């Protein structure tokens, strides 16, 4: 009946899942560029910039 | 390399340049190393007729 007794294993699983989630999330940032998607960058403007 | 061009279009002689001669007559590599020297020849390459 009582839950929340296996705190450590649940903590480990949650930490792993959260790390993976934020890693794949970080793919949608501009980082100071003008677009977060590379194909549009290639097909929108001139190669030197 | 040597040639004769209009005075206005000398801007097109540079790496990563777009234009008429830069795309249809003479193209420079993006990582070009060297020098370019241009000088007017109106008194010799131009005729009254």
UniProtKB/Swiss-Prot annotation, chain B:
<comment type="subunit">
    <text>Binds to host ACE2. RBD also interacts with the N-linked glycan on 'Asn-90' of ACE2. Cleavage of S generates a polybasic C-terminal sequence on S1 that binds to host Neuropilin-1 (NRP1) and Neuropilin-2 (NRP2) receptors. Interacts with host integrin alpha-5/beta-1 (ITGA5:ITGB1) and with ACE2 in complex with integrin alpha-5/beta-1 (ITGA5:ITGB1). May interact via cytoplasmic c-terminus with M protein. May interact (via N-terminus) with host bilirubin and biliverdin, thereby preventing antibody binding to the SARS-CoV-2 spike NTD via an allosteric mechanism.</text>
</comment>
<protein>
    <recommendedName>
        <fullName>Spike protein S1</fullName>
    </recommendedName>
</protein>
<feature type="region of interest" description="Integrin-binding motif;">
    <location>
        <begin position="6"/>
        <end position="8"/>
    </location>
</feature>
<comment type="function">
    <text>Attaches the virion to the cell membrane by interacting with host receptor, initiating the infection. The major receptor is host ACE2. When S2/S2' has been cleaved, binding to the receptor triggers direct fusion at the cell membrane. When S2/S2' has not been cleaved, binding to the receptor results in internalization of the virus by endocytosis using host TFRC and GRM2 and leading to fusion of the virion membrane with the host endosomal membrane. Alternatively, may use NRP1/NRP2 and integrin as entry receptors.</text>
</comment>
């Amino acid at each position: 009946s009582t839950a929340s007794a296996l705190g450590k294993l649940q903590n480990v699983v949650n930490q792993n899942a959260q790390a993976l989630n934020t890693l794949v999330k970080q793919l949608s940032s501009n980082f100071g560029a003008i677009s977060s998607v590379l194909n549009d960058i290639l097909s929108r403007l001139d190669p030197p910039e | 390399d040597s040639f004769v061009i209009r005075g206005d279009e000398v801007r097109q002689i540079a790496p990563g340049q777009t234009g008429k001669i830069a795309d249809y007559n003479y193209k420079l590599p993006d990582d070009f190393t060297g020098c370019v020297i241009a000088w007017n020849s109106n008194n010799l390459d131009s005729k009254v007729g």
